[PDB]
Amino acid sequence: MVTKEQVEASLTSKLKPIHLEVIDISGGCGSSFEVEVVSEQFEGKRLLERHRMVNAALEEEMKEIHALSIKKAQTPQQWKPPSQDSATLTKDA
């Protein structure tokens, strides 16, 4: 059992305030959060180590919550200058 509110500040601390967006898509408060991370732990890194690195700092977190899904493990080098949300077609471009 956890709160997403502490998850908010927790990931920001252990992973650093780069790009974190976790959202309980399971229960209400405590439960399996879907995180979107863009941090330097994915920088020219291999996707597998990418997840294994984020959850390293979030594994303790995962033990207290129901689950933590890193839906996105990306760095500003592939993220590059923002041109992804545009091409989501949520505003055409």
Curated annotation (Swiss-Prot):
Superkingdom as given in the UniProt entry: Eukaryota
PTM remark: Can be either glutathionylated or forming covalent homodimers, depending on the oxidation state.
Single GO cellular component term: nucleus
Family: Belongs to the bolA/yrbA family.
PANTHER family: BOLA-LIKE PROTEIN 2, BOLA-LIKE PROTEIN-RELATED
Function: May act either alone or in interaction with glutaredoxin as a redox-regulated transcriptional regulator, or as a factor regulating Fe-S cluster biogenesis. The GRXS17-BOLA2 heterodimer binds a labile, oxygen sensitive iron-sulfur cluster.
Protein name: Protein BOLA2
Organism: Arabidopsis thaliana
Upper taxonomic lineage: Eukaryota, Viridiplantae, Streptophyta, Embryophyta, Tracheophyta
